C-alpha cells in the first residue's frame, strides 16, 4: 500500500523532470553551431614515446606544470616522467599491482593510486630522505578504486566500484563525506575547475553532479545505453562529457540539465575508455578499444582527427594544463605525447 | 648539448630503466593464477593448503614461484575488472560437487550446481580468456559420495541416466563442465578431484602449469 503509493510518486516526479527538460530544449547545439566553421583536419604527431612500463597502462595524469606526468601500469610500478626529455624522475613500486587509477597532486608534492585493493595510497614525492614513501593508505571503500582526484594536498575525492564516491581528509585518513546515489559501479570522476563540484559516471548509465562541501547529489544525467567509463569537465565547469561502452560520447550541460550533443560514428562500435578536452574546449579527445584515439569537434560533433599509434586499447589520455600536448597511454605498455605543427 | 645537471638526470633515468628491466625479468619467471569459484565451494580450503579487496597468495614449488589471486571479495561487476587478469598462466576454478541437491540461500530457486555451471562457462567462454587454460577443481569429493547414496544425481540433472554410484556420477559431472568449453581447440581444461584431506592438489596445479608453459613456448617457437 504505502510502498506502492511511493513508487508511483517517483514516476510522477520523473515525468515532471522530463517535462521540465523538454520545456527548455528550445534549440539544439547542432543548430547553434551549424554556422561556425569546422576545425578542419587535426593532425598530431608522436613527439615522445615513454618506454619502461612492462604491462598494461591503466591510468596517467599530468602535473600542473605541464611537464611532469605520472603513469600507472599493472607491472606494479608508478613512474613519474619528465615529458620534455623522457627522463624517468621517479619509479614508485606499488604494494598492490592491480592499480586502476593514478593522480598527480596540483602542488606536485604527492601522487595517489589505487585499484582492486580498495585502497587509495598517497605517496610523498618531496622528502628529505630522497625517496618516495607512502604517506597514507585511505581505506573504507568496499569495492575496487576506479578513480581519484586531489583537491589539494589534504583532500582527495575517490570513486569506487561499490557505487559510492568519498571525500577524504588525508591527514586523518578518514572520509569526511560519502557520496551515495549511484546504483552501479562508479567508473570515473572529474573535478570542476574551482573544485567545488565534481561529476561521476557509473555503470548504471547515469552521471551525477555532486556538491563537495554539502555532500549531496545536485543533478542526475541519463542518456547513455551502457556503462559510463569516462567523464571530463568542460574548461569553464558548466558542462561535461562522458564516454560509455555504447560507442558514444555525450556532452551534458549542468545549467540546462540535459544532453546537448552526441559524438558517435557508425564505424565505431567499441567501448570508450577515456575522454578529455583541449584547453579551449573546442576539441574532445576520446580513447577507444579499437586501439585509436579520435579527436571530436565538441561544437559540431565531427570527427576532426585520429591518433593511431598504439597496438592495444587506449586506456587513458590527458591534455596538459597549458594545452601544449596530449598524452595517451595504452595496454601496449607505451605512452605517447602528441601535438600539431604549424 | 646537455648541462652538467641534465647529464646526471639521464644517468638517474638509465639507473631506473636498469631496475625496471630487472624487475620485469623476475616477474616474467613467475606464474600468475586467478582463483575463481562459488561461495563455500572449497576455494578457501585450496588456499589453506598452499600457504582488502583482492587477496594475493605467493608460494614456491619445485623452483617455480606461483602468484595466486583470490577475487572472491569483489562483489562489483566482474566485466569491469576481469580484463585485468587477461594473461594469467591458468585459471583455477573450484566447484563443490556436493552442491547439486542444495539451493542458493538468496535465490532459493536456483540450483547451486547450475550456478557453478553458469559461472564456469561465463569465465571459460569469456573473451579475455579465449586461450587461457583452466584448472578445474571438483572439491568435496568424499562428501559427494555420501550424498549420492541417499540423494540421486537426478535432482541436479533430470536427463542423467546412469548408476547411482560415485564412480559414474562424478565422471558425469566432470563431462558436464568440460562440455561447456565453447572452444575445445584454443584452450584445455584440467580436471582434478580434490578433498578436505588431499595433499596432491598443489602437484596437479604444477603439472598443469608446466603444460601451459610448454604450450606457450610452442606458440612462441612457431612449432604450434
Amino acid at each position: 500500500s504505502e510502498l506502492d503509493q511511493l513508487r508511483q510518486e517517483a514516476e510522477q516526479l520523473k515525468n515532471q523532470i522530463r517535462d521540465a527538460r523538454k520545456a527548455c530544449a528550445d534549440a539544439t547545439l547542432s543548430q547553434i553551431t551549424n554556422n561556425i566553421d569546422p576545425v578542419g583536419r587535426i593532425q598530431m604527431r608522436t613527439r615522445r614515446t615513454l618506454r619502461g612500463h612492462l604491462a598494461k597502462i591503466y591510468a596517467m595524469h599530468w602535473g600542473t606544470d605541464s611537464r611532469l606526468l605520472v603513469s600507472a601500469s599493472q607491472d606494479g610500478k608508478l613512474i613519474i616522467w619528465d615529458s620534455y626529455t623522457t627522463n624517468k624522475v621517479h619509479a614508485i613500486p606499488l604494494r598492490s599491482s592491480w592499480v586502476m587509477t593514478c593522480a598527480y597532486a596540483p602542488s606536485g608534492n604527492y601522487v595517489a593510486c589505487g585499484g582492486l585493493d580498495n585502497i587509495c595510497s598517497i605517496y610523498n614525492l618531496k622528502t628529505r630522505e630522497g625517496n618516495v614513501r607512502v604517506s597514507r593508505e585511505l581505506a573504507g571503500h568496499t569495492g575496487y578504486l576506479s578513480c581519484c582526484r586531489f583537491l589539494d594536498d589534504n583532500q582527495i575525492v575517490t570513486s569506487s566500484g561499490d557505487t559510492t564516491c568519498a571525500l577524504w581528509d588525508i591527514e586523518t585518513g578518514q572520509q569526511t563525506t560519502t557520496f551515495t546515489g549511484h546504483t552501479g559501479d562508479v567508473m570515473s570522476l572529474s573535478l570542476a575547475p574551482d573544485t567545488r563540484l565534481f561529476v561521476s559516471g557509473a555503470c548504471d548509465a547515469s552521471a551525477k553532479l555532486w556538491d563537495v562541501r554539502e555532500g549531496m547529489c545536485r543533478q542526475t544525467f541519463t542518456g547513455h545505453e551502457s556503462d559510463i567509463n569516462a567523464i571530463c569537465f568542460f574548461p569553464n565547469g558548466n558542462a561535461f562529457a562522458t564516454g560509455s561502452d555504447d560507442a558514444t560520447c555525450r556532452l551534458f550541460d549542468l545549467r540546462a540539465d540535459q544532453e546537448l550533443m552526441t559524438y558517435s560514428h557508425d564505424n565505431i562500435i567499441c567501448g570508450i575508455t577515456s575522454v578529455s578536452f583541449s584547453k579551449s574546449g573546442r576539441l574532445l579527445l576520446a580513447g577507444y578499444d579499437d586501439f585509436n584515439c579520435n579527436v571530436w569537434d565538441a561544437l559540431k560533433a565531427d570527427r576532426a582527427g585520429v591518433l593511431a599509434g598504439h597496438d592495444n586499447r587506449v586506456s587513458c589520455l590527458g591534455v596538459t594544463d597549458d594545452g601544449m600536448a596530449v598524452a595517451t597511454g595504452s595496454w601496449d605498455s607505451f605512452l605517447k605525447i602528441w601535438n600539431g605543427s604549424s | 648539448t646537455l648541462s652538467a645537471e641534465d647529464k646526471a638526470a639521464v644517468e638517474r633515468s638509465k639507473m631506473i630503466d636498469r631496475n625496471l628491466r630487472e624487475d620485469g625479468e623476475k616477474a616474467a619467471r613467475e606464474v600468475k593464477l586467478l582463483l575463481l569459484g562459488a561461495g563455500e565451494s572449497g576455494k578457501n580450503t585450496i588456499v589453506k593448503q598452499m600457504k582488502t579487496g583482492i587477496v594475493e597468495t605467493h608460494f614456491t614449488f619445485k623452483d617455480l614461484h606461483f602468484k595466486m589471486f583470490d577475487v572472491g571479495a569483489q562483489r562489483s561487476e566482474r566485466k569491469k575488472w576481469i580484463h585485468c587478469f587477461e594473461g594469467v598462466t591458468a585459471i583455477i576454478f573450484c566447484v563443490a560437487l556436493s552442491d547439486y541437491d542444495l539451493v542458493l540461500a538468496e535465490d532459493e530457486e536456483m540450483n547451486r550446481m547450475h550456478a557453478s555451471m553458469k559461472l564456469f562457462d561465463s569465465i571459460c567462454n569469456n573473451k579475455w580468456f579465449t586461450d587461457t587454460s583452466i584448472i578445474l577443481f571438483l572439491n568435496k569429493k568424499d562428501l559427494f559420495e555420501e550424498k549420492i547414496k541417499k540423494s540421486p544425481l537426478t535432482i541436479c540433472y533430470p536427463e542423467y541416466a546412469g548408476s547411482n554410484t560415485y564412480e559414474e556420477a562424478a565422471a558425469y559431472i566432470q563431462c558436464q563442465f568440460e562440455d561447456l568449453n565453447k572452444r575445445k581447440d584454443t584452450k584445455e581444461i584440467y580436471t582434478h578431484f580434490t578433498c578436505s584431506t588431499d595433499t596432491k592438489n598443489v602437484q596437479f596445479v604444477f603439472d598443469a602449469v608446466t603444460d601451459v608453459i610448454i604450450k606457450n613456448n610452442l606458440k612462441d617457437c612457431g612449432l604450434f
Partner: single-chain antibody
Amino acid sequence: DVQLVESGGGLVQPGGSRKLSCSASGFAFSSFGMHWVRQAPEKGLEWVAYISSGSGTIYYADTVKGRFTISRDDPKNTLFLQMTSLRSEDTAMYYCVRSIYYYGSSPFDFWGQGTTLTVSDIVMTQATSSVPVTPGESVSISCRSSKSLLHSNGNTYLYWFLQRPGQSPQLLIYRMSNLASGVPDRFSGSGSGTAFTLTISRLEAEDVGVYYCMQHLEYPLTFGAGTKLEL
C-alpha cells in the same frame, strides 16, 4: 635525521697518504651523488671530487687529479676519499656534500660537519670581501662569472651557500632563483647572465656569516671568494 659525519683527518707528513671517510645516515645514500669540498684555513670553498649515484661518473679537480681517489660503499653508506702524496696545498677542512640530480631537485642541499687535515674553468668573482650590516636592514650580495651560467634548457646554474662561523655551509638558493627547503623566505636570489645578486631582507643575527656563490654549469665546480657580513 640526515647526517654526514667525516673522519680520518689529522696531522700528516708531506708526501704522505691519508684516507677520509664519510658515514651517511638518515637518507637514501645510493640515490645521491656525493661531493668532497675543501676549505683552506682563512680561505674560500674548493671543490675536490664527485662520484655520482650508481658510481658511473667520477670527476676530480685539477689540483688533486691523479693523487686523490673518490669511492663509495652503498651497502655501508660510507663515502671515501683516498689521498696520496699530500702537499701543503692540501691543508684544509674537508666537507662531505650530498647532491641528487633529477628534474626539480636541489643539489648540494646537505653538507657534512667536515674533517680537518693538516700537512706539515669558469671563474666566480665576489670582489666585495666584507660588508658592514645592521639588523633589520636589507643587504644585497653580488657575484660574477666569467661565462654565462644560463643554459639552453632555461636553467641558470648558480648556487648560494651561507657558512655561519663554526658551521658547515648551508644551501640558500639553487639555480640562482629557487629557495631551498627550510630557508626563510626573506632570502631571494636574482640574477641575469653573468651578474647575480642575493637579497637578504630584514637581516637577523643568524644571517651573519660568509656567503659563497658556486657554479654548476660544468665541471670543475668553482666557488667565489666569499662575502662576509659583520655587525
